[PDB]
Ligand binder design. Structure first.
Ligand SMILES: [Ca+2]
Length: 217
């Protein structure tokens, strides 16, 4: 029973696309995009953005259950992210592109997130890549927050200032779920789709993909 796109790959489907996966302890299947091209393939996409067609200003429940479509932009849903990352040890890669043709990535040796009663707190270790030398996600641990669930480390409400659902600190150095600003708009925006150690706190990115695979791939 395919638990993730790593399984899908090892069974010989080497072509990127929509696949269905059967996550342990989850009542129903789930479609995901599998990227089979990137490291040596194997990647379950957990979020993707590229055109702004999908709105990321959603509440806790939509963040939990997922929204959008794996043929385009989407958020896989926290409950599923937790569930997949409970099945084994996963690593996380984050593909990013700016408006001038540049591609960069961040990678994490180890990723998982807590369950809902842990506010889906992020845990990460082992940052490398070309999207900056420091990690733009906090490594040390942050809750997940959205407009209706204020779980950040700030006295202010970060999801309200920056939009979207994210592991905000006192809003920290990233928000890949902010507002999508188009070509030539990407400049001077404070609540865009940002990764501070790549392009900075006021650049809005052209495109993001967050994906996971097991260490033993
Ligand atoms: Ca707060």
């Amino acid at each position: 029973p395919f638990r993730d796109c790593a399984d899908v790959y090892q069974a010989g489907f080497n072509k990127s696309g929509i696949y269905t996966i059967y996550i342990n302890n989850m009542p129903e299947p789930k479609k995901v995009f599998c990227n089979m091209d990137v490291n040596g393939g194997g990647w379950t996409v957990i979020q993707h953005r590229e055109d702004g067609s999908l709105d990321f200003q959603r509440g806790w429940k939509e963040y939990k259950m997922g929204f959008g479509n794996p043929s385009g932009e989407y958020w896989l849903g926290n409950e599923f992210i937790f569930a997949i990352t409970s099945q084994r040890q996963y690593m996380l890669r984050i593909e990013l592109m700016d408006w001038e043709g540049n591609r960069a990535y961040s990678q994490y040796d180890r990723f998982h997130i807590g369950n809902e009663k842990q506010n889906y707190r992020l845990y990460l270790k082992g940052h490398t890549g070309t999207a900056g030398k420091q990690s733009s996600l906090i490594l040390h641990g942050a809750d997940f927050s959205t407009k209706d669930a204020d779980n950040d480390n700030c006295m202010c409400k970060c999801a309200l200032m920056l939009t979207g659902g994210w592991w905000f600190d006192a809003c920290g150095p990233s928000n890949l779920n902010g507002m999508f600003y188009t070509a030539g708009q990407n400049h001077g925006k404070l609540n865009g789709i940002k990764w501070h150690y790549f392009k900075g706190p006021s650049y809005s990115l052209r495109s993001t993909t967050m994906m996971i695979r097991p260490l033993d791939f």
